[PDB]
Amino acid sequence: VDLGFSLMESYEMPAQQACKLGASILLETFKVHEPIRSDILEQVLNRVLTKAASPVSHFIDLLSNIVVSAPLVLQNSSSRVTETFDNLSFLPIDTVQGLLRAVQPLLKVSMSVRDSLILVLQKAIFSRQLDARKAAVAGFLLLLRNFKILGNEAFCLEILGSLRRCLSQQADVRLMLYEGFYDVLRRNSQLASSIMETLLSQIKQYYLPQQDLLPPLKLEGCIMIFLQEPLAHLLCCIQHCLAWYKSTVGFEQNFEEMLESVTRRMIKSELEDFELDKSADFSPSSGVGVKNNIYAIQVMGICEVLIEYNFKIGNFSKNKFEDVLGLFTCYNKLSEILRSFLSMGFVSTLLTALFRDNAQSHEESLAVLRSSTEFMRYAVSVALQKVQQLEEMGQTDGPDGQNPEKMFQNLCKITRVLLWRYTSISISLLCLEGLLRIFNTMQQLYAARIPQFLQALDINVTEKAAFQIRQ
Amino acid sequence: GVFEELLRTSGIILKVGEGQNEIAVDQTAFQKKLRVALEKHPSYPGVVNEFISGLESHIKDRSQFKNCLLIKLLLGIKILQPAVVTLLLEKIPEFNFPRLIVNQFKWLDGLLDSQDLVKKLMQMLSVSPVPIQHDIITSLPEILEDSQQNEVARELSCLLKQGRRLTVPILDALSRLDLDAELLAKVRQSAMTIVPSVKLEDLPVVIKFILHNVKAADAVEVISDLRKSLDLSSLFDVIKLAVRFQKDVSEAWIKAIENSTSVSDHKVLDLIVLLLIHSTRKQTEKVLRSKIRLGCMPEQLMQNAFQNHSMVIKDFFPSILSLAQTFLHSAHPAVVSFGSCMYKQAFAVFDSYCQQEVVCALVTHVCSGNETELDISLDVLTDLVILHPSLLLRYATFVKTILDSMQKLNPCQIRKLFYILSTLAFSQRQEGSYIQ
User: Which of A126, A128, A130 sits opposite B177 (nearest CB)?
Assistant: First the structure.
């Protein structure tokens, strides 16, 4: 055990091999030495909360691995978890989510730990510094999603009100909390009604309800210099919330009416309506210019979200696709002056619709979209950008963007369309770049899943691989 | 009365005297019931000010105010928002009486006129005495909305420039609250300047404040300043906590001693911090060994440092043992002399367990190794029995056991060994019968 512990400090690539070798030894000696469980638990717990000098994520992974094996082991060695909780918001590097997910079995069974953690969260939320506040709200989301509210309904209402008090905060916290709202929305039911009411209250401030005036969005309110209102993420979250509400089946009447009004105004809109019209209107490193850049990137995001929504509801209608083409023309006109908020499933469905969308039921609905080559270029470009994000980072933005199974299925779907487009016979070289990125990314990340993928595009891996090389 | 009838009409009943408020068990239930009832009551627009007079009746009764100790729910009405502020401003100078009012107002419901509240708080603190001013300063970060933090920071800096007694709580509040980067340099300079003039009671808090916020390169130069300013002073826990939570501070300290202390002699606190850093990469130990080999840190001052600084020796044991082990094998006369004097001082540690551990370590060193190590071990033992034989008699069993296992050595070593046994036995003849 002494050697196994010392290897962790020695490692601080063969170093990764040594660290994995220490983790394996500690896991094995915990699995074997039945009487020595408490000593190992105390040692690793003390080492975890010693000092946040460097990243200790592998220690947290070891903590999860050791505690998941023996559930009752944590209960015996309790009352030290609270001491670690007392100073969790000092050097959070995203390890707090892993620690909370690891020690959640301790929290659900014991009420004293829940009370102490709620006290720490109450201390964090009222703190006046952003650095602690971000970790506090991030852990708070995990706390909310951990406990089911199906039948503590009053407790759920009170804690949700406490969360809703946090809406007046900095830009980063507002940006991050919407994903947690979507997760807890999918987890629970009455929380859906309450949080949908809260979102309607939030968006009613900015909606500007009227008719016959250009620029429906009151973007000028959130000028500053620094941004504090990510409107595009807000509209994306609201779109997904309404989609889930319709799927799982009045504020919804107000939501759909407002979205219909804003898209109808948007198609009958031009750059003259916006502050930034054309030609010389902004420049970098200038106050008015850096202001206008924020409006530009924001309204590009809003255009992306409305294209997604209109394609979603517009079930095979020529007028809806014409409107979508209008939004695309506005988006491209603004883009020429100078990430993306699309989802994996939407992008896969769009690519399958555009390429190999052979169906007599279509009344040339896809024919209108297929006319614009820029639309096809943008459609492949977003897929390339998202695949690059998956390669560089662990997971991509958007809903359901961290479940590995959904990502693997979407990649398997996209690869077929790209191969078919290239083989059918610029556009093609972009597809080749995409295919190269898929193959490298799947080699690097999904090691064990290699055979099933080779089954998807159609046993011995070599035969299918040689078939693709022959292709 | 109008207010008394309105209170009992809906929401929460106002029990006269010591009775608790008769309302539902919920914080929002009062806001839903009493506020809605008051809004229904507000059909007469001109009576609300009269109701404010009725509210003054609730302010008139001291027993009613004591029963109020709710107050926050009643004060939450948007229409009567300035009335509560005016009542608080009137009752402030009238008179831990204001502590409850500050706690109720601190982290309370927000208002668009926070600038007016800040100005009123500053005006009250201008005339308020020391403890009320300190309480108001502590409640300030909760009261402040953080949008106007810059002006509050400038006002706090100006007050810190003058108020001698308010430096500690103001600095603590500023450290707790966020601040702009431009004002950070001014805050650091102001805190560093008052270090030689700072009071003893608030010294560790101020030291934590200067050492916690700044994590830049220029603080290394400030460390050089703290090489001089901190030495002028001549709990100790806050420094340890800051160093434990800040390795960059450790690196800054190491670089500061490496660049500056080489041509400015040294100090007792420098050696103590070196020991603390070594206890907590361990490059500082190697740097100190190199400095001692060069001829820095004379042991003559080290003896006085160990004698005077009893808490550091009593703070934690194994630093002295590690230092003695490191200096025992030194190839220079200064290093071995330093180790010998270090063990001689460590034997004076009051801890009986630590004392016997040090004696056991000395016996272990004498047990094997280089002959020079055995010679110096016997030399320090004869120095010890010359100093005090009674203290060594307590652990005489280990010494006798070690002497019994003397397999071989030079005749001088055997002479010295039987000399120490004979001296210990005969000098302790009252209880030395078991050794003879």
Answer: A128
